[PDB]
Amino acid sequence: HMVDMYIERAGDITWEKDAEVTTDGVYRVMTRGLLGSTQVGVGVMQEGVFHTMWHVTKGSALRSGEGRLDPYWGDVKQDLVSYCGPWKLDAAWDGHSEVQLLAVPPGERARNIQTLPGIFKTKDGDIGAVALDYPAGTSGSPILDKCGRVIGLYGNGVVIK
Numbered sequence: 001h002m003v004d005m006y007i008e009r010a011g012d013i014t015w016e017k018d019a020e021v022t023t024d025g026v027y028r029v030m031t032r033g034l035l036g037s038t039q040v041g042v043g044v045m046q047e048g049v050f051h052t053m054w055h056v057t058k059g060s061a062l063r064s065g066e067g068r069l070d071p072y073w074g075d076v077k078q079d080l081v082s083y084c085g086p087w088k089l090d091a092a093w094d095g096h097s098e099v100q101l102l103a104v105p106p107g108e109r110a111r112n113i114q115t116l117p118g119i120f121k122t123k124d125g126d127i128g129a130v131a132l133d134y135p136a137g138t139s140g141s142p143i144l145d146k147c148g149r150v151i152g153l154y155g156n157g158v159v160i161k
């Protein structure tokens with residue numbers, strides 16, 4: 001198994017008025033190996049805690065340039081994981097206003113996309129999600145709210161409770 005897996009900084013967490021209608025910031029998750037480097041997912045650094053999705057890393061310890069990051073807390077059913085500390089993204093969607101997906105796909109620059117999320121009624125339960133199709137590897141990119149905070153990630157949605 002290829003042990004090597006690192007992160008690279010794409011940009012910062014900012015709400016943009018104009019849109020399409022170690023240190024804090026977003027990082028793209030990479031895996032260098034035998035052929036080259038490829039993006040597996042995206043994550044969010046905030047309050048000295050790297051947050052991302054479980055299916056990206058799968059409990060794999062990440063490298064932050066020089067220093068190593070081991071995992072701290074995770075959840076497979078929720079599909080979440082935090083490094084160096086507990087989950088510190090308590091904020092969630094208001095349930096009516098529009099939101100901004102800070103999309104960070106492989107081999108292309110980061111950008112904000114303003115959009116109203118749709119509500120879907122899955123056989124398991126009723127969930128809410130953004131109506132934007134992006135490639136796998138973008139999964140783990142943050143969704144921002146009007147007040148600035150992060151309220152979920154790309155890939156999996158959230159249940160209405």
Ligand SMILES: Cc1ncnc(OCCN(C)C)c1-c1ccc(C[n+]2cc(NC(=O)Nc3cccc(C(F)(F)F)c3)on2)nc1
Binds near residue numbers: 093099117129143157
């Ligand atoms: C679930 C579903 N069910 C049935 N059909 C489906 O698409 C059918 C069309 N398809 C054939 C292309 C979809 C669907 C629809 C869209 C997507 C794209 N996407 C969004 C996300 N992430 C995400 O939404 N995060 C999130 C977390 C918390 C809160 C919120 C918010 F507040 F913003 F709502 C969002 O991740 N991916 N993925 C699956």
